[PDB]
């Protein structure tokens, strides 16, 4: 714990030191160097750290200066000073792996300037951090770094054995800049959620795959993604404010999600955002709820969905009298096995013979359900039966004939 206690006190020092008005940044530079060295020594020899972070200034603001990412911010490859030990630099690269996973661009460069370690991984890292703006000529880069926006995003993109997420975000920014048409600085200032939402409104033909790729690239948070998706769906529906053709336009949006259940939750929540008189778009909106919840089968979710469907039928559709929209919804019931709320209504709504509409059974299930309804819901009117089991009719006629035959024999 001597190394651990040393780290604790070392981190404690900056906690007060920051409170000072004029921070002797250079004086604490040795402190940060010592803190990192203590971390490395602990690794080599390999709540406390909780409180340490609780007062840690590893992310000290002015410590993360932009000039820490200057043109030669790292020592060159030939500037690989032989001050390291056998496994010290190895554990240093080990932690630096989490660092590149951590992604603190300024902090890593500050450590390197302090530690004077020539990880060529960091060399390409410093190459790319400013190559995001392409601020230096390609020939002007280092002898190992001197050797078409994506030319930089893929010249040695895979060469990053670790920290590939850096090049991933690099290409993400490259594509974003090429698309929107703004400089590196203007793009880099917009919020991640805002930029994603801006992508959401995009209706370019092939921008869907690139945008989804960039959404993977940002890697911010799933729930925000789901919120953005629900907002985009609502916006597209409001704009829209064949029937089998737009199903793909609908679904491919939900495809952007990671696991569809959270998207279903978000869509169900956004369904309450229906506008005043929003009926036609909201019909498809409600329709999407089943197409989402069914493929994963969250029974309670589907239960609330069925409640929502009955509510749409009664609160709105019953006053709306939209016969065609209701018919399409009933077709899209999915659990049309459980459509008792309008089952007798269709017959009462003069749909009984209208149930014989052609081209409405692409899979043939509508006519089968019509036969089921003729068997159960409305038995007796064989005319609608012919319009829509002939074995059931044969059995009934045979029973009537047998009854007539037995009446005489009685």
């Amino acid at each position: 714990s001597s190394m651990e206690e040393r780290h604790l006190l070392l981190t404690l020092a900056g906690h007060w030191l920051a409170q000072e008005d004029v921070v002797p940044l250079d004086k604490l530079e040795e402190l940060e160097k010592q803190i990192w060295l203590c971390r490395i020594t602990q690794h080599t020899l390999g709540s406390f750290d909780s409180l340490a972070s609780e007062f840690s200034f590893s992310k000290l603001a002015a410590l993360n200066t932009s000039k820490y990412l200057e043109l030669n911010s790292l020592p060159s490859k030939e500037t690989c000073e032989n001050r390291l030990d056998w496994k010290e630099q190895e554990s240093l690269n080990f932690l630096i792996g989490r660092l590149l996973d951590d992604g603190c661009v300024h902090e890593a460069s500050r450590v390197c300037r302090y530690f004077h370690f020539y990880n060529p991984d960091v060399a390409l890292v410093l190459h790319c951090r400013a190559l995001a703006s392409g601020e230096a000529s390609m020939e002007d880069l280092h002898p190992e770094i001197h050797a078409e926006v994506v030319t930089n995003l893929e010249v040695l993109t895979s060469k990053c054995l670790h920290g590939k997420n850096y090049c991933r975000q690099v290409l993400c920014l490259y594509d974003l800049a090429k698309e929107l048409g703004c400089s590196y600085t203007d793009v880099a200032a917009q919020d991640g959620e805002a930029m994603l939402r801006k992508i959401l409104a995009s209706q370019q033909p092939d921008r869907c795959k690139r945008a989804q790729a960039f959404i993977s690239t940002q890697g911010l948070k799933p729930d925000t993604v789901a919120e953005l998706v629900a907002e985009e769906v609502t916006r597209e529906l409001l704009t829209s404010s064949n029937p089998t053709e737009e199903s793909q336009t609908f679904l491919q949006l939900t495809t952007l999600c990671q696991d569809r259940t959270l998207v279903g939750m978000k869509l169900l929540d956004k369904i309450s955002s229906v506008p005043h008189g929003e009926l036609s778009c909201t019909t498809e909106l409600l329709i999407l709820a089943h197409h989402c919840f069914t493929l994963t089968c969250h029974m309670e979710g589907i239960i609330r969905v069925l409640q929502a469907a009955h509510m749409l039928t009664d609160n709105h559709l019953a006053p709306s009298e939209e016969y065609g929209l209701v018919v399409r919804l009933l077709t899209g019931i999915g659990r049309y096995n459980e459509m008792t709320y309008i089952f007798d209504l269709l017959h009462k709504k003069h749909y009984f013979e209208v149930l014989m509409r052609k081209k409405l059974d692409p899979s043939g299930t509508l006519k089968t359900a019509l036969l089921d309804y003729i068997k159960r819901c409305r038995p007796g009117d064989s005319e609608k039966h012919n319009m829509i089991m002939c074995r059931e009719i044969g059995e009934n006629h045979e029973a009537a004939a047998r009854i007539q035959l037995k009446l005489i024999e009685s």
Partner: protein, 261 residues
């Protein structure tokens, strides 16, 4: 105050009598090592085991999210009950860390909570988990039978089905539709008329273990997640097949959605 003990017996007696009096988080976290300081073997009893019972239970409760830490002190010193409670809130993902911690921390931890007890816990959990429904508040017998009212006892519109399910009301005991009885407090509606909260005591513990019906109907996902935790893999698969066979016969019944079934 500790050093000012009157007699040597008094120091040990106070140290022992203290812990059991509804301790506090830091209170335990200190008094434990405090009794450790100079007692060693002075009263082994079940005392050493009890000390261990938090000696790792702290680390157990010490793997969750910051906001999640708050309710973790509700039972942070009954580790056996703690794992089950962790299972209770449907909070699967949090379990995996606890399982790894227990396995890495079993290291001779003579605390009774041997991993076999853990396997029993998990098995019982899963059995409950994939389990498929297949003037005064009324009593259990006074609850209306599920097959008594084909339509809802209140809504009277949706028939009893796997998807079209219902619940038992808390006011008159009728089979009132949750849609018709969406409130929580003759046959009157709930409006007309929830994770585990564990404790040190076993009475309400039994009440909840007999009550905490995971309202989410039987969605294999939860079952697979829960099962993937214990170690009896072949036995796990046998349990899976057995539960499958248990499910099988229900199909011919007419109150289920056969397709999704």
């Amino acid at each position: 105050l500790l050093r000012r003990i009157p007699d040597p017996t008094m120091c040990l007696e106070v140290t022992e009598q203290s812990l059991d009096q509804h301790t506090s988080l830091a209170t335990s976290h200190f008094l434990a090592n405090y009794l450790t300081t100079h007692f060693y073997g002075q009263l082994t009893a079940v005392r050493h085991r009890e000390i261990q019972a938090l000696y790792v239970g702290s680390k157990i409760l010490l793997t969750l999210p910051e906001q999640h830490r708050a309710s973790y002190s509700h039972l942070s010193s009954n580790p056996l009950f703690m794992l089950e409670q962790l299972l209770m809130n449907m909070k699967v993902d949090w379990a995996t860390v606890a399982v790894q911690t227990l396995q890495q921390l079993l290291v001779g931890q003579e605390i009774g909570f041997t991993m076999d007890e853990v396997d029993s816990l998990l098995s019982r959990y899963a059995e409950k988990a994939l389990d498929f429904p297949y003037a005064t508040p009324p009593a259990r017998h006074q609850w209306v039978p599920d097959e008594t009212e084909s339509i809802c006892m209140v809504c009277c519109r949706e028939h009893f089905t796997m998807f079209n399910r219902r619940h038992h009301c808390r006011r008159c005991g009728r089979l009132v539709c949750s849609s018709c009885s969406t409130k929580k407090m003759a046959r009157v509606c709930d409006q007309c008329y929830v994770e585990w909260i564990l404790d040190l005591k076993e009475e309400e513990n039994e009440l909840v273990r007999s009550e905490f019906y995971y309202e989410q109907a039987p969605s294999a996902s939860l079952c697979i997640a829960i099962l993937n935790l214990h170690r009896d893999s072949i036995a796990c698969g046998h349990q899976l097949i057995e539960h499958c066979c248990r499910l099988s016969k229900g199909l011919t019944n007419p109150e289920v959605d056969a397709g999704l079934l």
